[PDB]
Amino acid sequence: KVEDPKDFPSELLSFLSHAVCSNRTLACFAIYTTKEKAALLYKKIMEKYSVTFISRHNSYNHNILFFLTPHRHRVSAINNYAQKLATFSFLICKGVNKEYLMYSALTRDPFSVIEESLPGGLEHCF
């Protein structure tokens, strides 16, 4: 087994906040985790946080979840909910600073959409 990723793919890092322990609240987040755990979290996060939009993407044999929330949350709050579900699988949760650029990159090589909550993906959300 290859070592689990320690961060998001290098292509995406500019779009993220790396201050994961901040008290700052945000309304856009991304999670890097296994294919199995991302599939589960897609449904769980959709309901828990009443997402405006959520999408799940292929990323280097893992998955990335991307979502927008109608209320603001600390990144650590999302992490707390998600690590509990991911159990013994790697999981990286970060806030997204550049919402449109992040989502756009996740829809194009080397990434691709697996499923998302709005048809035609987004476009009124950006």
Author numbering: 131 to 252, 254 to 257
From the paper:
This protein assembles into single and double hexamers on specific DNA sequences located at the origin of replication.
When the wt T-ag OBD structure was analyzed via the program SSBOND, we identified only one pair as candidates for mutation: Phe151 and Asp256. Therefore, to eliminate disulfide formation with Cys216, we also mutated Cys216 to alanine (Cys216Ala). Finally, using a vector encoding a double mutant of T-ag OBD (pGEX T-ag OBDC216A, F151C), we generated a vector encoding the triple-mutant form T-ag OBDF151C, C216A, D256C (termed 3XM). However, under oxidizing conditions 3XM forms higher order complexes (dimers, trimers etc.) as analyzed by SDS–PAGE. To verify that the desired intermolecular disulfide bond formed between Phe151Cys and Asp256Cys, we crystallized the triple mutant and subjected the crystals to X-ray analysis. The triple mutant crystallized in the same space group (P65) and has almost identical unit-cell parameters as the wt T-ag OBD. The final model contains amino acids 131–252 and 254–257, 127 water molecules and one citrate molecule.
